[PDB]
């Protein structure tokens, strides 16, 4: 028997994950209503804070301040890897002279007041050619994710690009045009990468020309463009017998392929016995 309302808000990015697990909880358990906002994460911590949700969704940790204001509160937060999150910049294979970029030259293409048209304009002695641009539409997760960690945390960027929901055409206009350049999530460019060449990415702290790999994005070498995605609720809110039981189906083998199913890359082992152990601490 367990039923009740759960309220879940959050990030754009984590959204797919809560809807996902919120209509298979759902189906298993028909006497919880789920309800899953959009509010960002800041915007989720917002409401976390004034005791408005139960359950926010996070693209990054909790900062210092929003964890200060929580505990001012007597809010016992509980964090939750669940996700990471990766997104590849793509070019056409017979593009050999940006195999390595910046997040700078990213920006310098993508930003909001960019009129960059010619890949010569991004970085001197490239060729003269124009750079044919696609990219995620507006205000989805990819976007959001791409624009906060390439332009700032503004979350936005030039619009005369070509945007697509489906990554798929996305793919199919960086294979048909030699001068493309793109951006999708990781599972998109690893099931077409015999198509595809994947921008190595150079952050200007710790990473040079990264390739995201399984390896590279597990080890946390490839940043800006993967990082983990949480969960947050409280040890008040465990209490309750749904809010707990919707956190432990999150952190299963089934929360799992769920996470692979939205297209996100799954948690590694260490991580999922350390929040499966965390929530036990939790409910104690």
Same mark, same amino acid.
């Given at each position: 028997s367990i039923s009740g309302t759960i309220a879940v808000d959050g990030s754009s990015t984590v959204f797919p994950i809560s809807q996902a697990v919120a209509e298979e909880f759902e189906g298993k358990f028909?006497?919880?209503?789920?309800?899953?906002?959009?509010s960002g994460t800041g915007g989720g911590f917002k409401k976390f804070i004034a005791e408005e949700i139960?359950?926010? *969704?996070?693209?990054?940790?909790?900062? +210092?301040? +929003?964890?200060?204001?929580?505990?001012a509160k007597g809010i016992d937060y509980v964090e939750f890897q669940v996700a990471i999150d990766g997104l590849t910049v793509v070019i056409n294979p017979a593009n050999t002279f940006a195999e390595c970029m910046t997040v700078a030259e990213l920006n310098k293409i993508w #930003?909001?007041?960019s009129k960059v048209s010619k890949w010569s304009e991004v970085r001197e002695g490239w060729p003269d050619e124009p750079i044919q641009l696609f990219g995620a539409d507006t205000a989805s997760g990819t976007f959001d994710y791409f624009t906060e960690?390439?332009? *700032?945390?503004?979350?936005?960027?030039?619009?005369?690009?070509?945007a697509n929901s489906n990554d798929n055409i996305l793919?199919? *206009?960086?294979?048909?045009?030699? *001068?493309?350049?793109?951006?999708?999530?990781?599972?998109?460019?690893?099931?077409?990468?015999?198509?595809?060449? #994947?921008?190595?990415?150079?952050?200007?702290?710790?990473?040079?020309?990264?390739?995201?790999?399984? #390896?590279?994005?597990?080890?946390?070498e490839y940043t800006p463009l993967s990082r983990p995605l949480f969960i947050y609720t409280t040890k008040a809110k465990l209490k309750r017998p749904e809010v707990a039981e919707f956190i432990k189906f999150l952190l299963? +083998?089934?929360?799992d392929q769920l996470v692979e199913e939205v297209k996100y890359i799954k948690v590694p082992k260490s991580v999922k016995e350390t929040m499966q152990q965390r929530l036990a601490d939790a409910l104690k």
């Open positions: 028909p006497e919880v209503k789920l309800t899953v906002a959009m139960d359950v926010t *969704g996070a693209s990054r940790p909790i900062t +210092e301040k +929003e964890a200060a204001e929580c505990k #930003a909001a007041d960690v390439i332009n *700032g945390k503004a979350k936005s960027s030039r619009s005369d690009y070509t793919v199919q *206009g960086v294979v048909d045009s030699k *001068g493309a350049l793109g951006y999708f999530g990781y599972a998109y460019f690893a099931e077409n990468a015999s198509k595809l060449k #994947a921008v190595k990415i150079s952050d200007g702290k710790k990473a040079v020309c990264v390739e995201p790999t399984p #390896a590279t994005i597990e080890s946390g299963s +083998e089934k929360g």
